[model samples]
Target chain A: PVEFPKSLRASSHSSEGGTTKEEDIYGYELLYRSAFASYIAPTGAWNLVWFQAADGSIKQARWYGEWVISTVLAPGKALQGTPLTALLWGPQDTVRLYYLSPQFELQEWCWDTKNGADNKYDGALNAAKVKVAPYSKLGAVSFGGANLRVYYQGTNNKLEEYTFGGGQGWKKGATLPGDPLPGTYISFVNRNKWDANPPSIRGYFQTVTGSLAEQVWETGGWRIGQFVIPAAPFLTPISATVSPEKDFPKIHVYWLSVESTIIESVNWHGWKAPKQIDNISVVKADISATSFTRDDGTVDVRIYGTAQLNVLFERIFRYGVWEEKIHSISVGKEIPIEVVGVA
Target chain B: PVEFPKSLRASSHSSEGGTTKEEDIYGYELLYRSAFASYIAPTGAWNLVWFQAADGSIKQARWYGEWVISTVLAPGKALQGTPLTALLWGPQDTVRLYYLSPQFELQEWCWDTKNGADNKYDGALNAAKVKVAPYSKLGAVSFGGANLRVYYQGTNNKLEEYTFGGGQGWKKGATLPGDPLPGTYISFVNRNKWDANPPSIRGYFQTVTGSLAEQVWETGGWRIGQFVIPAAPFLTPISATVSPEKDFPKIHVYWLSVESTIIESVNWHGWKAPKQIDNISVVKADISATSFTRDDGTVDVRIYGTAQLNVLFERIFRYGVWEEKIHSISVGKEIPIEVVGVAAAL
Candidate 1:
């Protein structure tokens, strides 16, 4: 076998793609995945169990979990927070909260009182259970009333979905039905944001099949059925799903909050919003979604992409206005975990 | 702002830390969590959704999802494969399954029914929503038949959990009564494993709690805690929570499934299993969780973590069987994700 530190050469031969038979191609320089810890930020979704109840109530099922957020400082601008999980819930459905803690267990809760009521959170469903029917790396879930949909990034860098009859065994229902083809990015749909080679499905979704797929492309622009379906309310989808029914299924959609609006409608594209989230946290990502369901079945919608803070809240009209905010709490760090590192 | 490629000098500071008066040391390098697409295959539960009722069974609730298996090389290396998804059901107390196409958005009752139905599973909840939680960058979820527990790498370099009553909030939970302390690696806890430093959880958890909150640390490793918890008997921690009786939820947790049974069973402390779902998915402190519940009150659990392979899994399961096998999967890439990387992070 070839070894390191040897005077090797880079030749085009029968090797894997991007691979050369030479032992040391760039003067003893070895290229591998970045250090595992280089990506650690104590910013992942460690322990927060979220739940949507039959009463249209939503809240962090519990709390008491914490994590440490760390990052590298090259220079100039600081690494705000690492991109752990990108989440987006509804705008006017219920609540959005961000929690801060150091104890290393993921925990979320919905109490028995929205200032005065039983924590109505009846456990939510596992969206991953539905197969998006694609061989992609990224997968997402969205729901409406009793109907739930899961989206997966396809090999072509597109989004695909699998809808269940509301139970198990996904059914090949409909493509996201976006302005872009089912697997195409939104850029190609909206001429303004279209790129001959825009990246694959990079943002979120609001509605699965009801109004076509609304997507946020890398161009920092949002496009709804700009592809196949061109209509209002369904065009330009968020990285969340739109539930027509639930307590207020509208909250089921992600990245649809005012902050998301600021990102998609105001930012250079939705990209700037993530930078802001990074400024606030240590880690961040490009996709996320949540929902608001009520026992009475009243629903609204909210979905956004690239959030930096951990959000917690139940469906309670905290002052007559639909509000979403991170939870304010103190977290302790006493738990230890094995971490990936740099070598 | 001094940008890259500027006239900034690369002076090696004799002092401590990587910051200098001239540069904003708070900045660092970060790979996209999606970077996992470059290497390793995606594992864990995919496209999860909660089902209220289906067919004629009020007690029977079905969950839709799928788990990906990485292609394995000779001896025990993981080979990338075409990721796939499927549908599952848990009613009358058992989890059943059906298969679907990986590439096409089509459903097959059974590309081969046996393969799908043969494996019945239920985890702590139903299926842990695969993905990341933003705030702490750790995996978070609401789980537990009898209690809700969150497991994550701490500032002390150990995997710790806080368990509360089913209806209890974060304020009223107790540490799971156990032998391993708060700063010990989850995999290292295995009585069958052995190693030197063997993925120890040093001053990990302590660095991020109480008054020290929000400040990032330079001394410890990257901690990733959540991803899509699958719906079967595949990983250990994940396979446990299928039903509602609370009997010790069988957890089948997946990480970077590497190769080499020897390495999988004995190496790098206690981490020695195959890499599961998103071995290469970007890892951070994001925690996210979702449970499957039925009208019958039977709920299952699954949790997930993100990372670009072992760079994430190893930090949590240092002494785990997955940690050992992950390296073997990448003979072609020869990644340290399974072992060396965790060591290097320290």
Candidate 2:
């Protein structure tokens, strides 16, 4: 009980995360596992699930009924509570898991999609043993099929990347441009131009001072720039998403306003507009957006924000019309949710 | 071949997804077809590329020099790996090509965007074909102009929402909510007191032994409670975010051990700190928090963990700041990615 500061206190309102139902067919079903359950979007087979056991070791499970058909993947060390994240790509065969070692290096466990010879990697991805800001989260995406790049905020609050492909097993971590505020989350999207420019990698992060920042890979080098919203975000989380079907080249950004409204900004080519998503009280940390095509070929966009009272709601932008809906999640604690699929 | 445990193994670290750059523009670069190629972030009229082929199947190619000059809107079966994601809004006039059915859900292939006899519900949102989970991954928020609510997590772990507004036409699937651990990833933010005590929804899931748990929208709702972080997560993933820029009441929550290590606990109405984000290791998952502005309008506040390793992090506490970042990905192998703007049928 030390005296706390005024800026870090929780607002009078807050909330927390998962579940499901039907009539919701054609639509995907919401499922649940223990809080420890981690996920890998479905590949050739089915969506997979993983989690830590009471013993602190890692385990894997697939959707069986309620709980997954549990199984042990790797034994755990005394290390428990370590953050676990994974990456999958290639002919739906390779899978990689990233974790932090008490030793301070970001370590990874790799294996193939289906069990077999090319399956598990010999040891930890620590080959380059790239030292990093311990407990830092990871950002990764694949370009040109098998080539991939992984990123993190290094010790100096600067962005760093570790790449894999070619004869080079794993390269050392190289620092990317800008100096993002510490704790800033990094998101990467590869825009495949299908040309000599190769696939360009675009990275997004929020600055400590609350500015929306971006770095793009154009002509073999990385260039950085910041997108300023009309009003500043005191200290809210910012998210970036893209519409695979929009007629132009652009990215969508959502952030909490200095006032409490969920603000959306669309950066088309170079011009950007920060439009307020009308009628929504978003609990910080709980917002996501995606663009989808309806049955009639019309492109529709949907965004979700956890309300101040903890109920989940969605806003839709059909072609040009905007609407809202209160989903079936009753009065309960809800955490921010992440949506997969094409936007 | 070795015998694999039904539970343990590669399914554990496995992942699938979404990304890229430029200079030399107009080169016919090889694009992927895992339904990850369609994107609407770029502004221009050409709606870009998608999965379709010569055999009338699915193939992907983006803007050649400008707008993809010679490509047909619809192509058919056989060509495999067609990255299946589409988008739409309005009178469904701009219907996007969602997907190819291994099972003929292909009833919807063509359409227009404006109002006509071609507007409104045509078939069942699969009528009973409505086969999604009941209390699935939640997606919500509070708005002003055209107020709303939406939620749907179907079997594919893909999200499908049943929307409510002016005219109702199942707006489609939008993948949302992280592939969270069974129980630990539960979040609930309410848009109550619009003076309206809306139907509250509280979702929670675990402990060592998988138990499905929750707090409901019982009568006279709006009572608040703080979720305490347990002593051990045993390698579990933790996520935090906020809705700061809203009509919420207040902010502040900071914790530090006797050694000056920062520990955080957030509750309603205010109480806070900040000095050193020092001496501590933060797991990759528990990385997001926000800094926000107070009534006084001064900018101050940042929260995050730093190990004895010398890293400092901060989470703004103004309106919305719940998020996590995966900083370093290992250099092993990479996989093809997919982009699902929102979980809709592909």
Per-candidate TM-score, chain A: 0.30, 0.60
lDDT of 1 by residue, B69-109 (tens): 22211110110111111222221121211111111111111
TM-score, per-candidate, Cα-based: 0.27, 0.38
Model 2 misplacement above 4 A: A1-104, A109-124, A193-197, A230-235, A246-250, A258-262, A276-283, A286-343, B1-346
**DockQ, all models:** 0.02, 0.02
Candidate 1 residue runs with Cα over 4 Å from true position: A1-150, A153-158, A163-170, A175-279, A282-343, B1-346
iRMSD of all candidate structures: 22.8, 22.0
What TM-score is obtained for chain B in each of the predicted models?
0.23, 0.23
Candidate 1 lDDT tens digits, A251-322: 122222111221222121221222111111111123333323333454322322221121221221222234
Candidate 1: residue B297 Cα off by (Å): 63
Tens-digit lDDT track of model 2 for A128-228 = 66655532445665655556677776766588888876657677645787756454545565554212126566777765433567878767688885564
Task: Indicate the worst ten consecutive residues by lDDT in candidate 2 chain B.
Answer: B18-27
lDDT of 2 by residue, B1-346 (tens): 0011111111112122210110111111111111222322212222333433212344333333433323333332311222233333231234333332222132222234464534322222333234333222233322221223333345443333443334654455333333322223232333232123343333222222222122223355422233433322211222222323234523333333322334444433442433333333231222223233345443233343221112222333322433333122111122221111111110
Task: Provide the overall lDDT of each model, using Cα atoms, as 2-decimal numbers.
Answer: 0.22, 0.38
